[PDB]
Structures are given as C-alpha cells and as structure tokens.
Scaffold this active site. Structure first.
Site, PDB file in Angstrom:
ATOM      1  N   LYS B 232       0.786  -1.222   0.000  1.00 55.01           N
ATOM      2  CA  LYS B 232       0.000   0.000   0.000  1.00 55.01           C
ATOM      3  C   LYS B 232       0.827   1.287   0.000  1.00 55.01           C
ATOM      4  O   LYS B 232       0.434   2.274  -0.643  1.00 55.01           O
ATOM      5  CB  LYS B 232      -1.062  -0.038   1.122  1.00 55.01           C
ATOM      6  CG  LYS B 232      -1.116   1.140   2.033  1.00 55.01           C
ATOM      7  CD  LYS B 232      -1.773   2.391   1.473  1.00 55.01           C
ATOM      8  CE  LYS B 232      -1.557   3.470   2.587  1.00 55.01           C
ATOM      9  NZ  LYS B 232      -2.189   4.804   2.449  1.00 55.01           N
ATOM     10  N   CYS B 290      -2.286   9.797   1.645  1.00 55.81           N
ATOM     11  CA  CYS B 290      -1.456   8.712   1.088  1.00 55.81           C
ATOM     12  C   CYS B 290      -0.322   9.234   0.212  1.00 55.81           C
ATOM     13  O   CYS B 290       0.824   9.165   0.604  1.00 55.81           O
ATOM     14  CB  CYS B 290      -2.345   7.708   0.327  1.00 55.81           C
ATOM     15  SG  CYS B 290      -3.418   6.808   1.480  1.00 55.81           S
TER      16      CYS B 290
END
Lengths: 475, 475
Positions: B232, B290
């Site tokens: 991720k 992110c």
C-alpha cells in the site's frame, strides 16, 4: 495572407520525388516503403561510391538487401520497387536538386561505448550535401536520432550555410524520429504511430504528407521539431526511471527482509488507463544507448537553449538519480556475491566466478553498454578469475565469451546470473552443484530466473535481487 | 514435522466463526460479506455502547446500516444475513473467545490536524480487546490501513502482552488491507484483488481461507505481513513518482519553449504491457494523505528492521525527491503568475488574485492537503489580496471559500486555475475579461482546462503548466 513558404509549397503541388540519404538498417525500409506508395513517383537513395559501401549501389540496384540479414519482407519489397522504376540507388548527390522532399536517415555510430555523444560526422556530411544542393520549396526531414535542439540549431545552421536559403521561408525542415527494431522493420514502421515535427506549421504539414502514405494502422503524431526530438529522449528517460523505481524498491525490500516480487505483484493489481503504475522488472542493471544516455541529452538540451528553468534548487533531477541507481546495480550484484562468499568465509581474491550472461536482453546478442562489464571489472580487480558465458554473443572486444556452459561453471565458487536467457531458466541445482563441486556453491541471481528453494535445498548459498527474506536463509 | 501453530490450526479445523471489530464504513460490509458466505456459520460484529454509536447494536440487529446510502445492497445484505441468523452485533468483547478468526477493521481516521501518522487510538483499543480474549489457534487479521512495521511490531506486542501467548506459535496473525471507496463498498471488497500477508506461511494460509470465499472475481494475493503493509505505501509512492515525472518534464518543456502535451501524447503512443510508460498529467501539485505521506513511511520503514541498505553513495531516495518536485508545483504556479504580471509591469503586491479551485480533483468536495493552500499563502505574503472559489468545498477551517465565480473574478488582476472542475472548463474568455475588467487580464492554468488561443486572442496574458511556447506569446 500566405507566408512565403506556404506559397512555394502549394506551388510545388504534392510530394512526388523523395530522396533518402543513408542506405543502412533504417534508410532502406524507409526509401523502399516511400517508393512502394501509389502517390509518389521516384525515390532516390543516396550512397557514395565508397570502397566500404559502394557495393550497396549494385546490390540495391538489382533488388537485393546489402544487410544482415533476412529481415522478413525486405529483400522482397526492394525487388518489388526496383522493377517499377520507382527506386534507384545513386552516389550522384547533386540530384536532390530535383526532389520535393529529402530525408536523412544516416546511422549515428558512437566511437567507444564512449559515454554520451555519438559520432555525427556521417550525418553532418549528409546535411552539408543536402544544403549544397537544396532548392526553394524543398522539404528536409532529419530522420536520424539527434539531441534535442539539433533541428533548430546546427542542422538549420549548416543547411543555411550551404544554400543561402532560410529554413521556414525558402524551405521546410522537420524531424521525424524512427522508433524501429531490426527483425520487425517494415511493419513496425507500418503499424505504429510516427512522431513528426516541423520548425513551423507549414513544415509539419508538409511532413505529415510525407509519412501518412506509408502507414497501415499507425497514425502520424504531429508536433514541433524540438517537441519531436524531446519525445525520443523522454520515452527513454521515463522507462529508465521506471526501472530505477523498482531497482530501488528491490534494495528497500532486501533491507526489510521481504520479497520485492510480492510487493510488485500487489502494486501491479491496480489496472487501468491513467491508473496502472506500470511497474517494470528489477534486475542487474540497464544496458544500451538510449536508456543509459537519453536523460543526459534531455538535460543538455535544457541547458543548450538557455530557456529559463525553475526547479527546487541546484541539485540532481530524479532522472539523474535514476541514472545513478540504475548504474549502481552491478556494484550491488557484486556486494551480494561478496556477501554470499562471506557466509562461508570465502574472500573473492582467487575465487572462480562463473558469469552467466553478457548480453543484457533475454535470448539476444547485444552486449552494448552491458551491466555485465562493470561487474566483471569489480571481480577482476578484487582478485577473482572470471569465466563468462552467453549462448548468443559471438565476438566481443577484448573479452572471452564461452558458449560452453559447464566449461564456464566448472570449479566455480559463485554462479552469477546477469542475463535473463532462457537457458538459465532451465539451470538445475543438481547439475550446477555437481559441475562446480565446492560443497556450498554460491548462486547470485539478478534476473529472476532462479527458483531459490530448489537451490537452497541443494547446499547453495543463494542471493537474488530484491529477495526477502531469501538472503538470510539457512544452508 | 508440523509446526506448533500448524497443528493447532489443523486441530481447530476450517474457519467457521468469525468476528469483526469496527462497526464502520468498512467493517460493516466486511462482517456482513463474511456472514453471507455459505461455508461460514456466524459472524459477530463488535460495538461498545459508545453513547454516540451504541445504537448500531440494535439498528444492525434489526437489519439496517448508517449514514448516506451505500452500494444499495448494504442494507439488504444486513437484512438477509440477520434474517438467516448468521450475523449479530454485540457489546460483549469476551465472545472474541468463541471465534476461529477475528478481524480489526477499525477506522484509522486521524488527524485531526492531519499528518504524519494516523490516529491509531481506537485501533489499538481494538487490538487490546482482541489480545484480552485471544485463545490458542485463533487467527487475527489487521484490516485497518497501517504503516510498515505495525503488524510485526506493535500489533503483536499488544496481542502478546495481553494474551500472554506467542504469535506464529500459539495464534496466527495477518494483514489484509483494502482499497475501497464509499458508494462502491460491496464490489470493491468482492472484485478488488486482496493483499493478504501473514507473519509466517501458516498465518498467510489461514488468512487466505478467511478471504477466498467472499471474493467473486477478485483474487487473493498472498505474501508476508510486512510485504502487505509495504504494498500500500509502494502504490502511492510509485504514483507520486509518476506525477513528479511529468511535472518535471513540464518544467523542462517550459524551458525549451515546447508543449508538454505533445511530448506526452508522443510518449504515450507506446502501448503495453511491460512497455507503456503509463504517463500521467502534470499540475499545480499533489494533495491527499497517502500520496503526500507514504514515502516517508517507506523511508522510516527501510530503517526499522535488522538489515543493511545498499544504495549508491550520497543518494537521495528517488521517492524523497519525487516529494520535492511535487511540493514545488505551488511555488512554480506562483512564479508563473508573478511572471505573467511582469509582462504588464504589474507586481503581486496590491494586485487581486482569483483562485479558481480549492479542492484538487476534478469536481470533488475535498481539500485534504490542497496544493492550493501553499499557493494562496505565497500570494498573501507578497501583499496581494485573494478570493477563493470552489463549487463544492464548503467550510474549510480558517479560510473563506465562495460559491459564485463572478464575485471572485470581478476586478481580479490574475485568474489562476488549480482544480480541473468542469465549471472552469466552461469558463469563456469574454466573460472573464469583462468581469475581471482590465484590458490585459492575466490567466494562469494549473490543470489544462483553458484553451490558450481563445484567451490570448481576447487580450489575456496566459501561462499554463508546461505550456510551449504559449507562455511567451505576444499579446
């Protein structure tokens, strides 16, 4: 109102007569493809009566390819066109004065794998000749690989030196880089998009007209001459950075003890146009000219034209950083092998290293700018004997390549896989253990062709690029 | 030759009773997908009477969800599963004891003021509850988004301190993150491949069993827990790098007076797979959590373990320097707007700037780390007054945003586009010219929505990211 070039060009009508200077791997399919087009009259390919190259005139003037070699459909095509009076090879360069469009597809060598600058003498020659005989209303397209700014720079300056005419007034100038692979020549041309950039709109349309006719599935991508030269460099610069991105993930994964391939395949599960990530494969380095030099040309190109650049400060650009990570990968392979020998207490000085792979492209013969060479050098300087294997590479300057696996792997303390050849993907632990002897042979894998569990289970000390989590395994 | 854990697992048999902790946007679909899978018997969802959330126990147990309408199968899925007696919500964490597996799907929201790490407090509370009731042979799965090193680090410490048992011997531990969005919950979980990483092969295989039955089209991607966590971060990092790549080429294209978009369409004509350069779009900057934060997590991550990182000398992680390229783009936007006012003999100070766009995605309501903020800040310091427009973003903290374009644009010296909202793609030159009033109003485009010639022909002074060759336009 119409500008001077536009008048002259509409006054020429369409392109009927095309000339191609450079009778080599790239200008022969071009000339002949031009000539195979319904809407063009003659194409002249220009080749000087050199003792080196004079034989091309007679080979070509009879429908034969002077090259190595078979190249599907090529011989055949030249034949088709020689017969119809639509192709002729000539050393009479003063013809050119009779053409509507002239193209320069001259090979652009490189002295030694001498770092960045290819040698352009052959090309500049072609351009002088074009300029010497250049006439108003002509279209000149440089098809050779050239460094951004060449069309608007030197190419223009010599072409104008020779003729007394002005680019974008008396004549059109464009650049149309030819992205092409030997073996798939004719149809790569036919089938993929062609980038075409003139110094002005008038020149780019005049070129669109040149290249459109040859395409069956490819489209022309029209733009400025500089934008075209930068597209060549950028396509390589970006692929380079993609490789350096995973090479770096590989290094990060080793330090964390995880498998880069599993992280890679997780990343890769994100699919879709504008979504993918497009993650490449990590490996023991990057070879060739394009991938290893094109960022320097793009950066030189920014510099040469002295446009105003703002960028974070004065440091390195990610592309330069990509060059350096990619360049480090051979020394990384070496540290791995030294590390592997250490687990056994085994030095390097006076070790045998069986190197598997000189070429860097799987099942291929080009070792040009090979990542294998910087690796061989580190082993030799540290005191190892090295034997090299590759089943494709025939004769390389001042280095022995054996085709005999086994001769190469015999008595080897370490087996180091540098090229992802098919033969190495069939290398079995049993055989390698028995031909190298040793008791714990070392195997270092830089191309993801070794299944580690087979080898580990066999007494090997294994390392792999980006490998867990494999590299601190028990033997 | 079976391990202790392997034995407990074979002895516990196939997973039949599952628990989910975290009755939120993700844990409800998850729990409820598990309960619908024939093959599983009964799922427990775990909720406190958090005055505030207590109600969900009874709502869910009648067969209903929370706020905003979801994958309008959510409420029907709950109804079905509840009616079949395969799902129940309980405040009684002690019943974790009765399960074969428990999942932690706890919102890891914060924040609140954002960065650099999430607020894990509720997550860690859940793990504690799990640890508290953990039994031998149970499987525990982290489903919440975590940072590299959490599973093998604090997650297991808590699990181990509370239970007094050992991970990878007494119980199984995995990490199964999801990438999911509201409105698309049910199919994301079902159709998205699912990264599942165990702390050892035994926990990985136990976890694959937990997740295979709800996948319909999606496939499980099995790896180590640590590799799962890195996956991720790597996906955001690599994306962040692709963005910094074109953004960078845009700066280079500005310097060379060429169009980034022609270079980019040229490049993009190389079609995959393993070939595509997968070229994104350059812009005023990168926003979100992110994309802006993950590479710092990789960086810290590379150094948390025992393991030597081999990287070339001097360095700079490619990713770290991606973060700086992308962080620069607001300053680049600012230099372009200053540059555009220079052309008129105007200066930032005393000038009015209309910010068209505060969110950073085409038509989104979210401005989490908007690259519009550092831009707005540069103008305000230089002495300019600023009005911010956005059709979607209401209620930014300590910053006033407006619905109506007219009031924002009226009397403005510079019009500056930072979100690609559709309202801005419809912006017509005449209108902005008259509302700005001015004669030579300045428009600066960060998102490729303004057609240059329309605005140039109407008196404007234009700049766009990586635009030729439009930025030195005569006006």
């Amino acid at each position: 109102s119409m500008s001077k070039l536009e008048k002259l060009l509409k006054e020429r009508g369409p392109i009927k007569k095309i000339g191609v200077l450079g009778m080599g791997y790239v200008g022969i399919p071009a000339a002949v493809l031009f000539a195979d087009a319904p809407c063009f009259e003659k194409v002249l390919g220009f080749q000087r009566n050199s003792k080196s190259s004079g034989y091309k005139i007679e080979m070509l003037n009879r429908g034969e390819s002077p090259l190595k070699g078979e190249e599907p459909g090529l011989e055949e095509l030249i034949g088709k066109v020689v017969k119809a009076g639509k192709f002729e090879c000539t050393p009479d360069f003063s013809r050119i004065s009779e053409l509507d469009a002239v193209t320069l597809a001259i090979q652009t060598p490189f002295a030694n794998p001498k770092d960045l600058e290819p040698d352009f003498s052959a090309l500049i020659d072609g351009i002088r000749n074009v300029g010497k005989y250049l006439k108003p209303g002509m279209l000149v397209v440089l098809e050779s690989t050239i460094t951004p700014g060449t069309t608007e720079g030197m190419a223009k300056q010599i072409l104008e030196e020779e003729s007394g005419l002005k680019a974008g007034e008396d004549f059109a100038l464009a650049h149309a880089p030819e992205r092409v692979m030997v073996g798939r020549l004719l149809k790569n041309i036919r089938e993929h998009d062609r980038i075409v950039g003139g110094i002005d709109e008038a020149s780019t349309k005049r070129a669109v007209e040149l290249y459109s006719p040859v395409l069956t599935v490819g489209q022309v991508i029209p733009m400025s001459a500089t934008a075209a030269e930068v597209t060549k460099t950028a396509e390589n610069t970006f692929r380079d950075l993609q490789i350096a991105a995973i090479n770096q993930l590989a290094l990060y994964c080793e330090a964390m003890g995880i498998n880069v391939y599993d992280v890679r395949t997780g990343v890769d599960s994100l699919k879709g146009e504008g979504i993918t990530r497009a993650v490449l494969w990590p490996g023991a380095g990057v070879g060739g000219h394009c991938l290893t030099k094109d960022t320097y040309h793009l950066e030189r190109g920014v510099k040469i034209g002295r446009g105003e650049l703002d960028y974070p400060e004065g440091a390195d650009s990610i592309y330069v950083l990509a060059r350096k990570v990619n360049d480090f990968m051979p020394a990384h392979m070496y540290n791995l092998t030294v590390a592997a020998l250490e687990r056994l207490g085994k030095k390097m000085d006076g070790s045998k290293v069986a190197m598997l792979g000189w070429a860097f492209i799987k099942d291929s013969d080009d070792a040009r700018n090979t990542p294998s060479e910087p690796y061989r050098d580190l082993c030799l300087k540290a005191g190892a004997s090295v034997m090299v294997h590759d089943p494709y590479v025939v004769n390389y300057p001042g280095v022995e390549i054996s085709d005999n696996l086994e001769e190469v792997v015999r008595n080897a303390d370490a087996i180091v896989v540098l090229a992802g050849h098919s033969a190495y993907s069939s290398l079995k632990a049993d055989w390698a253990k028995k031909v190298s002897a040793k008791a714990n042979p070392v195997i270092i894998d830089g191309r993801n062709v070794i299944e580690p569990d087979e080898f580990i289970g066999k007494g090997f000390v294994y390392k792999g690029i980006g490998r867990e989590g494999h590299h601190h395994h028990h033997h």
